[PDB]
């Protein structure tokens, strides 16, 4: 939203679109930089991918694979030279079909069920994808134990700068209670190493599914004939499918009050109706859900980003970890 800056971006789109055979009539800047390009009668999406060329290609080819396989992801329009993308400077440009649909309302039960079935569809459909020759794989298979340790060591490291701010309620409460959550973090790592996590990750290294890694109401839509579409595949990588469940369910249920088990059931039941999980697989998920990822995000706002948050937000983050621990104690 600006004066000369808006016409600057519009002119970039017009210049880049010459590479495709698209009748550009009206161009709107939306969001990575995204444009809605209106044509004769129906639109296309022009996206400037921000990410480095190696990671960019992995997701571009992943999307082409999924689109051509029949999964509900926007298809890629080939350019005049027959390629899925054009390189200009340090950026990749891609033209996708603009999908028409409404966003989901997480307070409505049927939408919560739709969004989970689409996640299951995405996971199942992605199995078989391998990037082309020269494009390296992006994978996190078998890395969670190290990722937990890096985070438990990072929470210890932040006590150095926590002790620096002597007259600060957030840092005062942090120095008093954080050790108990760090200890539990490393104990959750130990529980993960006794689960089927390792054999499961090793079996998937051979024929892996993709994890979306940023799945939510911002990247999904309900189109015609109640079809669920997944829109932004820029952060896809190979990982256990349960990562997307955790990453979607735990933040949604974040609360200082009561654990919403009904919503938890509605979401897992909907996911499992299309991609059922064994008891062992679910154990791995529940173990991962106990790790303090949401507490970490709240701590990262205060020490890395330096946002002066008050004591209430730290205690509120600790309380959700306790509430969640009680809710999942019998499932791990
Ligand atoms: N191919 C696409 N189809 C539909 N919506 C899109 C596409 N790319 C980006 N968007 C939308 O842009 C909006 C941001 O204002 C989001 O709601 C997102 O769904």
Author numbering: 22 to 52, 57 to 357
The authors write:
YtaA (CotI) of B. subtilis is a member of a family of proteins specific to the phylum Firmicutes, which are implicated in spore formation and often form part of the spore coat. CAKs adopt a protein kinase-like (PKL) fold, with distinctive CAK-specific structural elements.
The crystal structure of YtaA, at 2.5 Å resolution, has an overall similarity to previously determined CAK structures. We therefore modeled the ligand as adenosine. However, the two primary adenosine interacting residues, W123YtaA and I256YtaA, are conserved in most putatively active BSKs, suggesting the observed interactions are both relevant and indicative of a family-wide pattern. In contrast to other CAKs, YtaA retains the Lys (K72YtaA), but completely lacks the Glu partner, replacing it with S84YtaA, which does not form an analogous interaction. The missing Glu may be functionally replaced by D259YtaA in the Dxe motif (DLD in YtaA). The remaining active site residues, which are required for metal binding and catalysis, are conserved in YtaA (as in APH and ChoK), indicating that this protein is very likely to be catalytically active. Remarkably, the electron density maps for the YtaA structure show additional density for an unknown ligand in this region. However, it is unlikely that this ligand could be the biological substrate of YtaA: it is distant from the key active site residue D239YtaA (D166PKA), which directly coordinates the substrate hydroxyl group.
